[PDB]
Amino acid sequence: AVTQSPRNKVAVTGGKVTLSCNQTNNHNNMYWYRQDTGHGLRLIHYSYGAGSTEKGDIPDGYKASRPSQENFSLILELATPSQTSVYFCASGDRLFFGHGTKLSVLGSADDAKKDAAKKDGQVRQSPQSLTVWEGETAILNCSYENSAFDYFPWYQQFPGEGPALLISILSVSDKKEDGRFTIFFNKREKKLSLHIADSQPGDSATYFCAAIDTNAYKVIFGKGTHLHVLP
Amino acid sequence: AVTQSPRNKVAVTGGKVTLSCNQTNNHNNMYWYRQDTGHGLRLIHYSYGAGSTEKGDIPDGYKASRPSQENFSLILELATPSQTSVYFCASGDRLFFGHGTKLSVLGSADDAKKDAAKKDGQVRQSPQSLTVWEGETAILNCSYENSAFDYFPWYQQFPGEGPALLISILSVSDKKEDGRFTIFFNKREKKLSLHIADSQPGDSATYFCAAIDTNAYKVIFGKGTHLHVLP
Predict the structure, then answer these.
(1) A98–B contact, CB cutoff 8 A
(2) At residue A210, what are phi and psi to the nearest 5 degrees?
(3) Does this chain's domain A1-106 share its CATH topology with A122-231?
(4) In B, which residues are within 8 Å of A98 by CB distance?
């Protein structure tokens, strides 16, 4: 058995956290990993016997102590929110893992309101990728946080070309219609939709939604939707 | 109306690049963006009239010059590979784009060295996500670059638990079979497959391939395959 303690932990930024691991396997080697999206398992620190600690691939912000054969601790002296993760102890000669410790390091004042300034200047598109058969209505969506945005242009971009204006709406309206192209604009929800009716293969392109403050003179772009219209 | 020059450029990490944009719209504002996977369009520098330049969201490593109404230049004094991208000039008062300029920055001797050194210690899994119906044979794939790796365990990990060893092969062998679980291992090609025959819902899990040098004592993990076996 490899047993970890605690199994869930919440801490505050700047706090100190210690994670404990106990093994009964009688193994010389122990390991601390964390598990994150996009990263798999990254080795933080390890130990090849009692009294010894070795920095792993990602040591910074952590220390370790192997006081005895059975015990390997992981010490976060100044917890940061980047330390939020699932942490796994393992013992080996042929490698056995604990059950995991979920750690949540909370943000600041500073963090929470900087992370609100952040969002408020973003335009968010969904989906990133949209595949429809020809004849479906393809529906692309955009959302924004600034109430001062009043003009909403959409751009259409074909491979090896620059974006070209497709269709726009001013916040005074709830609907703009031009051929196969309709904008629906919900000012209370701060949410816009572009409907391409009777979709054709030749409408396959990257679609960008922007949000322009017509007074403060600044242009904010969504990251885009890749549209694929299949015959 | 908005024309860039050149349209394709290749340069060397030492060098200096200048991108030119010429507009005919008689517009006061001009903009330089780059386009990258994941980032959408990001504004590097802009200009609100002849003689004026303003840093955008991502100015570091670029300069800009607005010598006249018509002309807006983008200068990379010390081109890094991070500056490889498609660059778009736009003019405005309502925003028009050029056609784009593909810039490729190579890639020194130290770099290509460092970059082969990093792959060589890496284990690669494909695909990140695999969905099959129950009864299909789920095939998960792995590959490595170091010839010294000779022991290849697989781990199976269920939600809210640690990885547990599933099945392993030694490089002396080309096939290991245990129940529903087969490893096929190609030493010449350095490629390894796990086959789950007669797959069932309860096989849904994250599967890790690892490569272990039994001599040099290091565990290298792949990033994982999330398997979904649908009833």
Answers:
(1) yes
(2) -115, 165
(3) yes
(4) 162
> Chain B closest CA to A38's CA: distance in Å?
7
Let me know if B134 is exposed, middle or buried by CB neighbors in 10 A (0-12, 13-18, 19+): middle
| Resolution (Å units) | 2.4
Which DSSP string corresponds to B53-66?
-EE-S--TT-EEE-
Contacts of B66 (CB under 8 A, 6+ apart): B30, B47, B49, B50, B51, B52, B53, B72, B73
Candidate from A90, A155, A162 with C-beta closest to B99: A162
- Residue B149 near residue B212 (C-beta atoms within 8 A): yes
Q: Which residues of A touch B163 (CB under 8 A)?
A: 41, 88, 97
The Cα–Cα gap between B209 and B191 comes to: 11
- Chain A residues in contact with B41 (beta carbon < 8 A): 163, 208, 221
Question: Which two three-digit tokens encode residue B78?
Answer: 């010390």
Nearest to A40 among B95, B153, B223 (CB): B223
Q: Does A58 touch chain B (CB under 8 A)?
A: no
- For A48-84, b/e burial (b = at least 16 CB within 10 A) is eeeeebeebeeeeebebbbeebbebbbebeebeeebb
Name the experimental technique: X-ray
| Contact criterion met (CB < 8 Å) for A160 and B90 | no
Q: Does B100 touch chain A (CB under 8 A)?
A: yes
Say if the Cβ atoms of A40 and B99 lie within 8 Å.
Answer: no
| Residue B53 CA: distances (Å) to CA of A36, B6, B86 | 41, 21, 21
Domain B122-231 has CATH 2.40.50.140: no
Cross-chain residue pair B100–A162, CB shorter than 8 Å: yes
**Does A221 contact B100 at a Cβ distance shorter than 8 Å?**
no
The CATH number of domain A1-106, selected from 2.60.40.10, 3.40.50.740, 1.10.3470.10, 3.40.50.1980 = 2.60.40.10
Interface of B with A in 68-87 (CB under 8 A): none
Greatest Cα pair distance, chain A, in angstroms, is 75
HEC letters along chain A: CEEEECCEEEEECCCCEEEEEEECCCCCEEEEEEEECCCEEEEEEEECCCCCCEECCCCCCCEEECCCCCEEEEEECCCCHHHCEEEEEEEECCEEECCCEEEEEECCCHHHHHHHHHHHCCEEEECCEEEEECCCCEEEEEEECCCCCCEEEEEEECCCCCCEEEEEEECCCCEEEECCEEEEEECCCCEEEEEECCCCHHHCEEEEEEEEECCCCEEEECCCEEEEEEC
Domain boundaries of chain B, sorted by first residue: 1-106, 122-231
